[PDB]
Amino acid sequence: MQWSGARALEALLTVAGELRGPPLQLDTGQLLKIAKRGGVTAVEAVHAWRNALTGAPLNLTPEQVVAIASHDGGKQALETVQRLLPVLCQAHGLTPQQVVAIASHDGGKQALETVQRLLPVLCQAHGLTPEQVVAIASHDGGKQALETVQALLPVLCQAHGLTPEQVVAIASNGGGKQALETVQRLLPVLCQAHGLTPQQVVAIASNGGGKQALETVQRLLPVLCQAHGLTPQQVVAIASRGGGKQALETVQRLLPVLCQAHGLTPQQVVAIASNNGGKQALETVQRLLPVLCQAHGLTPQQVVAIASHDGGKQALETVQRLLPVLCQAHGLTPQQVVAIASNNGGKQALETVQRLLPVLCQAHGLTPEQVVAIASNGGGKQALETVQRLLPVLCQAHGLTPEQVVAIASHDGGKQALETVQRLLPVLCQAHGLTPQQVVAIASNGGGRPALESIVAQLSRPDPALAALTNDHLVALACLGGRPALDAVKKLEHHHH
DNA sequence: TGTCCCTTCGCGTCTCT
DNA sequence: AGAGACGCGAAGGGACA
Known part of the structure; x- marks a missing residue:
């Protein structure tokens, strides 16, 4: 948006304003979101057919349009969606959300067109479910994954003895075509030579950049075991748990340095690299471990804890940066800051704590x-x-103590629990006669949302399990183990009673 | 410059157990 | 309770027209 022509860009700001206009109603964040990954052709196209997409047969929401648009070749997808959404939904049985999900990617046109062209031959001739075809296609380069699945699924299943589930697992990722081809080539080589169960070979390929990880494992598997004293199992961990090529390479490169000079166990090094952006975490503990754990206060164990997660780099960097301010200005022990950072999205927690500790403690x-x-x-x-x-709304409109709200919030997926309590605490308490503290009890666990959702669905629309269990029982189960421990009981009557 | 494809990395939620 | 699987999606890069 720099150097090609004098004057104009007048037509661009004309439309940019009008998209705040009624059909779509886009905010600033959304427009820039489109502009960034979709380009201007995208922004233009959105405007161009903003009415056509809102009503008509399509009846898409604004956020759906934004989703489709904000990708390389967004214009192309938006067009192909208008054209194919109804035929895919009617003539092939998909939901709109599924069509949107296929479209909301780079090269959406190609994916949509290839789904139409091949959803039958896959579902009929290879016995795949349409869910599975959507899964393969709902990625960048879906066309290629689809096309490759068709070509290699017979060969992979007969010759190399794989389930279709496994082929799908492989293809249902970015660069599936690659992962698939690379497995075909390297399945025999990795199996009889480097001694890996086919399950392990599929494990590795069933991530993004699987081709890389397969290739890199074959190459570096011997080395890492003899020279660096790892197990094959440990090597496969690193390769399958997200680290991929980058982590494997970085392990080799920094294993001696981290063990000898920085004093870690090879167990800990593996734990750190077996993750997304292992490379990043390792390099981030090579530096920063000294200054963290020898000036910034912490023990190696604690640093290994922070790093042994997705985005460990980010966590370490934001710990090192905010550990002083949080300890000093807000009065938290290092042990609390480490606890906050030892999770997925540590960086995000520490930063949010910083800006909301005062707010929560004063105003609330x-x-x-x-x-x-x-x-x-x-x-x-x-x-x-x-x-x-x-x-506030929970304490006033629904009558909960703060201590209750905090208890609900204090579990993985807190947000979901809270939101779901708000939604369902009414229907549960009046229509089915539960008592708030029961509803809170259910919610105050991991998987609290689906626990609630699951417990409602049971009461409101009783299944074969004809009562058998009373309401108070179901609650006890639901607290005991949520949806799992509910589906499990359901599944102890279906073919039974 | 836009479109398509591939790889790496990070965030969030649930379940195993 | 913590570890690990899963889903979702941003970000970066390469190839080609």
Whole structure:
């Protein structure tokens, strides 16, 4: 948007304003979101057929249009969607959301067109479910994954003895075509030579960049075992758990350095690299471990804990940066900050804690101890933000104590629990006669949302299990193990009674 | 410059157990 | 309770027209 022509760009700001206009109603964040990954052709196209997409047969929502648009070749997809959505939904049985899901990717046109062209031959001749075809296609380069699945599924299943589930698992990723081809080539080589169960070979391929990881494993598997004293199992961990090529390479490169000079066990090095962006975590503990754990206060064990997660790099960097301010200015022990950072999205929690500790403690009346409990979970940021937002409405409109709201929030998926309590606490308490503290009890666990959702569905529309269990029982189960422990009981009557 | 494809990395939620 | 699977999606890069 720099150097090609004098004057104009007048037509661009004309449309940019009108998209705030009624059909779509886009905010600033959305427009820039489109502009960035979709380009201007995208922004133009959105405008161009903003009415056509909102009503008509399509009846897409605004956020759906935005989703489709904000990708390389967005214009192309938006067009192909208008054209093919109804035929895919009617003549092949898909939901609109499924069509949108296929479209909301780079090269959406190609995916949509290839789905239409091959959803039958796959479902009929290879016995795949349409869910599975959508899964393969709902990615970048879906056309290629689809096309490759067709070509290699017979060969992979007969010759190399794989389930279709496994082929799908492989293809249902970015660069499936690659992962598939690379497996075909390297399945025999990896199996009889480097001694790996086919299950392990599929494990590795069933991530993004699987081709890389397969190739890199074959190459580096011997080395890492003899020279660096790892097990084949440990090597496969690193390769399958997200690290891929990058992590394997980085392990080789930094295993001696981290063990000898920085004093870690090879167990800990493997734990760190067996993750997404292992490379990043390893390089981030090579530096930063000294200054963290020898000036910034912590023990190696604690540093290994923070790094042994997705985005460990981010966590370490934001710990090192905010450990002083949080300890000093907000009065938290290092042990609390480590707890906050030792989760997925540590960076996000620490930063959110920083900006909301005061707010929660002043305006909403909470101990810091409570805030840290909320923050010391997966998706801490989300809970904190949701607590702030929903604490008042829960306490007033639904009559809960703060201590209850905090208890709900203090689990992985806190946000979801809170939101779901708000939704269902009414219908549960009046229509089916549960008592708030029961509803809170159910919710105050991991998987609290689906626990609730699951417990409602049971009462409102009783299944074969004809009562058998009373309401008070179901609640006990639901607290005991949520949806699993509910589906499990259901599945102890279906073919039974 | 836009479109398509591939790889790497990070965030959030649930379940195993 | 913590570890690990899963889903979702941003971000970065390469190839080609």
